[PDB]
Design a protein around this ligand. Structure first.
Ligand SMILES: *[C@@H]1O[C@H](CO)[C@@H](O)[C@H](O)[C@H]1NC(C)=O
Ligand SMILES: *[C@@H]1O[C@H](CO)[C@@H](O)[C@H](O)[C@H]1NC(C)=O
Ligand SMILES: *[C@@H]1O[C@H](CO)[C@@H](O)[C@H](O)[C@H]1NC(C)=O
Ligand SMILES: *[C@@H]1O[C@H](CO)[C@@H](O)[C@H](O)[C@H]1NC(C)=O
Ligand SMILES: *[C@@H]1O[C@H](CO)[C@@H](O)[C@H](O)[C@H]1NC(C)=O
Lengths: 82, 107, 121, 115
């Protein structure tokens, strides 16, 4: 709806050429009232005179577990399996 | 449906000649138009996208311009390797549509 | 490195059906929407159908709409086209392709397969 | 001043990764059902080495990086990626994040040059 939304999280990691297992929720970072279409994107790197991962979102129903402190600690991807 | 058309249907030209091919859209498609070149027995190859954006690896002798319903493709100096059929395709609105194709002969 | 390979072509009778497929490798198939295009002998190109990256939204040309179905399997990196009620006019070479597009597919690169011939007789 | 400096994709498993807060309403001690654009569990995620091609945006993107040297500074988002259209540029520097939307004429292979 013209709004560019960004969520984020930052942790340390001690694993090597892969993403970690376990649950972690990303918090809202910014919501920008830009009003433009986006169909393509590219990364910007600093080069002197690291690795990244890209996945795509889909319309899915989730069951989210909010703990006693209001943080999401677990989830079920309802369309994954029976 | 946005229909596409091309002119001329065919042309003859020699090496070193300037070749101009006209593509027209049935309706305003901004700058959203792809230009493809096809040789007999082969799949089409993209030369230009978004009206004027040249594809990487395409010789500088090729160019294109235009907007709305009006687009032109140009070869500034025809080479013997440029004998092919050229198609123009609009990707502004689905379903997508290709033009009839313009055939270039060697004179 | 990037390859698109069509298969399932051949000769069928009018009113019949045929399932075409296109195997993909060398690129992130599951990231791109995919198109089908056909070319009858001595004729120009005709756009057939499009499917989005997630295998959700599907689009067809009026000449095939209601007869043909487009689908994909992102775990097998394969695109499919299921044709029913075939006619003599459907005789053509069928190509699978990732067409450059800044509006719908978001494709930066343009790739085509080798094509497969389908004849209705 | 612009400077002019394809490989087969690698893939990894996103086991239970990419979940975010669907809204800003406080909840606790509850199981809440929501429908939104999420990264499917155990999906095949594309892995790159900082190999910086233009990618499709589709319906939204989950992005992650592992580094100890702050190489990834930002992103370009847009359609034509040229002066013909408005494009979104997000960059980080030593003190701030800078975000702009303009008819940017981007370089064929954009980067930030560090001395
Ligand atoms: C943005 O997307 C809408 C909906 O598809 C379309 O009508 C509009 O023309 C697009 N504008 C630009 C600049 O791409
Ligand atoms: C909730 O927060 C309290 C501190 O305010 C902490 O003692 C408790 O362990 C937390 N519960 C969980 C599940 O983290
Ligand atoms: C991920 O790729 C593997 C093959 O490497 C395949 O077996 C699996 O089904 C794929 N999963 C998804 C969700 O595509
Ligand atoms: C990079 O390539 C573009 C397009 O050919 C050219 O205009 C530009 O001058 C080149 N930059 C350098 C430093 O050569
Ligand atoms: C970071 O960007 C801001 C805004 O343009 C600028 O004021 C600041 O000086 C920049 N920091 C550095 C180190 O360049």
């Amino acid at each position: 709806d013209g709004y560019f939304k960004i969520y984020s999280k930052h942790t340390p990691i001690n694993l090597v050429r892969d993403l970690p297992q376990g649950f972690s929720a990303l918090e809202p970072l910014v919501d920008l009232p830009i009003g433009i279409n986006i169909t393509r994107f590219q990364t910007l790197l600093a080069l002197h005179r690291a690795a990244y991962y890209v996945g795509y979102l889909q319309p899915r129903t989730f069951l989210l577990k909010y703990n006693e402190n209001g943080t999401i600690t677990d989830a079920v991807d309802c369309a994954l399996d029976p | 449906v946005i229909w596409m058309t091309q002119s001329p249907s065919s042309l003859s030209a020699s090496v070193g000649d300037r070749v101009t091919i006209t593509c027209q859209a049935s309706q305003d498609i901004r700058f959203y138009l792809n230009w493809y070149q096809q040789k007999p027995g082969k799949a089409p190859k993209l030369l230009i996208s978004d009206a004027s954006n040249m594809e990487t690896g395409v010789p500088s002798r090729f160019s294109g311009s235009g907007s709305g319903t009006d687009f032109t493709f140009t070869i500034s100096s025809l080479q013997p390797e440029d004998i092919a059929t050229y198609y123009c395709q609009q990707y502004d609105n689905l379903p997508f549509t290709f033009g009839p194709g313009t055939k270039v002969d060697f004179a | 490195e990037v390859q698109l390979v069509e298969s399932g072509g051949g000769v069928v009778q009018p009113g019949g059906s045929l399932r075409l497929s296109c195997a993909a490798s060398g690129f992130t198939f599951n990231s791109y929407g995919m198109h089908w295009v056909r070319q009858a002998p001595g004729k120009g190109l005709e756009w057939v159908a499009f499917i989005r990256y997630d295998g959700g939204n599907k689009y067809y040309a009026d000449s095939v709409k209601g007869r043909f179905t487009i689908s994909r399997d992102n775990s097998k990196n394969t695109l499919y086209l299921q044709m029913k009620s075939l006619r003599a006019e459907d005789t053509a070479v069928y190509y699978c392709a990732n067409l450059k597009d800044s509006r719908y597919s978001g494709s930066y690169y343009d790739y085509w397969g080798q094509g497969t011939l389908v004849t209705v007789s | 001043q612009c400077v002019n400096l394809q490989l087969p994709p690698a893939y990894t498993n996103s086991f239970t990764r990419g979940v975010y807060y669907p809204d800003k309403v406080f909840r606790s001690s509850v199981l809440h059902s929501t429908q939104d654009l999420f990264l499917p569990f155990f999906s095949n995620v594309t892995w790159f080495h900082a190999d910086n091609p233009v990618l499709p945006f589709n319906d939204g993107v989950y992005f992650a990086s592992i580094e100890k040297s702050n190489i990834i500074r930002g992103w370009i988002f847009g359609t034509t990626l040229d002066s013909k259209t408005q494009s979104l540029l997000i960059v980080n520097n030593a003190t701030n994040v800078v975000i702009k939307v303009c008819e940017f004429q981007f370089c064929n292979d954009p980067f930030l040059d560090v001395y």
